[PDB]
């Protein structure tokens, strides 16, 4: 049998779901038909309302301690949790209920991992990342806004193949995808090394692909596979297309100053 | 009970709750009341999420705003970023160069195609298609139906269909149905024969593989998809032909062109024919419900001028229609404080005075989660929402006090109206509509051995079928437009203009100390606007009015209903405990709840 995945959505923009289906190796189609059993997921599932919620207890009973809980987005603590309502109840109640019998928990994206855009100051809903709510279960964080498609399916593929969570760094991220900073292997690195920078958008330097550090590129402080694995079957990545990394996979990047303010050290 | 907009709302019948509404973006609760014959006589739209992006933006740099508001939604990804940069450019009197304009249009039209096609197959189709019925299609007959529905589509052989069918069979025979688990399969609300069902599920799977190719256009110009990068003043993807180190060279543009041509093929051969065929059969079954406000009141800001910054050349020309009068299109001004206004009378927010609607330059977003006295259940466990008080995280936008439907259907009704008044920029959508009417009324019925009908566009369009149809036609038209945009872009580059960003007012020291601006976008789901106030280089106010905010809106101060609630009215349900008809019509608006609430 294929391992059941219960994919819950909290406060979110749904970019991780979209990114997931952009995966070429493997195809999302093959993931869903041949690898996992995607038994709950608001965005794709046929059933709604009472029929949708009935699926949760059925899968939890039958596959107790042998299903993966995937979480996109996060729970709010303000408004008595009712700034995210599911089945008339706060999302945080659904999250805690489904998490208690999961063999593993995946925090998809920066929302679930760290808090996301909704947790940026002043955070009116008190959006809280999954690991601050679920404290007694093993969680793997797959940060990024969204994470690269192949990173997402790569995590799933490893977990399905070995029945284990991959080795994690201190922050709970898989080392197989998050051990390098963007800056390590960025193809503009030789320009950085020679002090060759863009100073204004569409200056001569920009038309020659010079380093984007002075335009605010946060590649030197951001861990992700963007400069190597790259995006959408290795088509490009933010830096290749001419905009600096904004640090979207790092904890609290929204409140680390303007995206166009350069790093100092 | 009370009457509004020609609808007789009555909450005395059996109450039915749908929470969660699935196969949408984000979180929605829907409640209806049905009469003794299972006809919906009341409908309640509840947005069940909020994040407060408008609050979060206060005090930040306007140049950073696009990246924040882009994360309103990863489905309509980039449309908020476009609205934001337009708004800031409007406030600061910045004109972008021609290449930046064309690249933004291409990115926008790429989103339209991707968004529309994925929605129809992966969110909407299971409201029309019974997957279990597809298990019993004759592969030969399915091949035969495919040749009639779209002769040009190469994937049509009999073997190819039993291949798909057999993979579905053992998927279902495994006992783990995945996304098909607990479905409403077998309901009499499904009318398609097995062959149509297998054909559609095949295209569901085809589309799932292809959709990832289309967005590589975003990846080239914007680095990544979801959430491509944008820029105040232009685009970051600098151009150099002679070169491999610049973001955009001729090789990258050739790649973009190849993807556009694939899009045009998919729209013409798969998407539009499927919707025409599925639409024909449900029209034959008499399922013309779900028109709602489309029968009277539709709005769009107007979009896609073939001459930049000249709104009279909009290829999807906008404005407002009232009371079903298609002979008179009122101009819509996003700057006019008496036009676009938002009420919170029945929303979980507070104003100083909630008997008035606020224009978004004067907009206020202060949360106020409180439930009415007639609620069944508690504050943290709602059994039956009280629609007589505040019942949604969605605000209530109105235009000059009128409730409007927005979206591809609205744009196509507006384009049709414009074409009749002599507007030649709307000629293609008119051609599409009349071609579609003739295909649905005569050509497809004739091919399928069915009686031919004589529905006019006035009768056919204001319906759930019509709303689904317009989405497919808009996808096709957007593909055709970006094909032309590509040629204009390449021609401009080859003529010597390589400019991609205007940076004259990039530095805040050049800005006026106070400024306000508005950016509008014909987003996939309808009329999108961002309204900004700038003070001393910071965001003083930032307010979004988003398409699903219009459509999904709760009642206003006068008690007028929004598009969702109006469209569910007067619709029979085969089984009141199975929300098949509710989902079909709701999904025809392509609801994006994160968008609606932001
Ligand atoms: S563009 Fe960014 S990541 Fe690449 S070399 Fe420059 S600073 Fe490092
Ligand atoms: S902005 Fe994000 S997608 Fe990668 S290049 Fe930077 S971590
Ligand atoms: Cl974050
Ligand atoms: Mg708003």
Numbering used by the authors:
A (entry chain S): 5 to 269
B (entry chain L): 3 to 244, 248 to 603
Pull verbatim passages from the article behind this deposition.
A prominent member of these so-called Knallgas bacteria is Cupriavidus necator H16 (formerly Ralstonia eutropha H16), which employs four different O2-tolerant [NiFe]-hydrogenases for generating cellular energy from the controlled oxidation of H2 in the presence of O2.5 Among them, only the tripartite membrane-bound [NiFe]-hydrogenase (MBH) is directly linked to the respiratory chain. The MBH large subunit contains the catalytic center composed of a nickel and an iron ion, which are coordinated to the protein by four Cys-derived thiolates. The most distal cluster relative to the active site is a [4Fe–4S] cluster coordinated by three cysteines and a histidine, while the medial cluster is a [3Fe–4S] species with three cysteines as protein anchors. However, in the proximal position, instead of a standard Cys4[4Fe–4S] cluster, the O2-tolerant MBHs possess a [4Fe–3S] cluster coordinated by six cysteine residues.13–16 The unique architecture of the [4Fe–3S] cluster is associated with a redox-dependent structural flexibility that allows two redox-transitions within a physiological potential region, i.e., the cofactor can assume a super-oxidized, an oxidized, and a reduced state. In order to obtain insight into the individual role of the supernumerary cysteines in the coordination and function of the [4Fe–3S] cluster, we purified C. necator MBH derivatives carrying exchanges of cysteine for glycine at the positions 19 and/or 120 in the small subunit HoxK, which are hereafter referred to as MBHC19G, MBHC120G and MBHC19G/C120G.
The electron density distribution was interpreted with 50% of Fe4 residing in a comparable position as in H2-reduced MBHC120G. However, an Fe4–S3 distance of 2.9 Å indicates the absence of a covalent bond. The remaining 50% of Fe4′ in oxidized MBHC120G were shifted by 1.2 Å to form a covalent bond with the backbone nitrogen of Cys20, bringing Fe4′ into hydrogen bonding distance (2.8 Å) with Glu76 of the MBH small subunit. This particular Fe4′ position differs by 0.6 Å from the classical Fe4 position of native MBH in the super-oxidized state, and the distance between Fe4′ and Sγ-Cys19 and Sγ-Cys20 is 2.9 Å and 2.7 Å, respectively. As observed for all single cluster variants of MBH, the Fe3 was found in a double conformation. Approximately 75% resided in the native Fe3 position and formed a covalent bond to S4 (Fe3–S4 distance 2.4 Å), consistent with the S4 occupancy. The remaining 25% of the Fe3 were shifted by 1.1 Å toward a more cubic conformation (Fe3′). However, a covalent binding to Sγ-Cys19 was not established (Fe3′ – Sγ-Cys19 distance 3.2 Å), resulting in a three-fold ligation of Fe3′. The proximal Cys5[4Fe–4S] cluster in oxidized MBHC120G is even more flexible, forming a new cluster scaffold with altered redox properties and electronic structure.
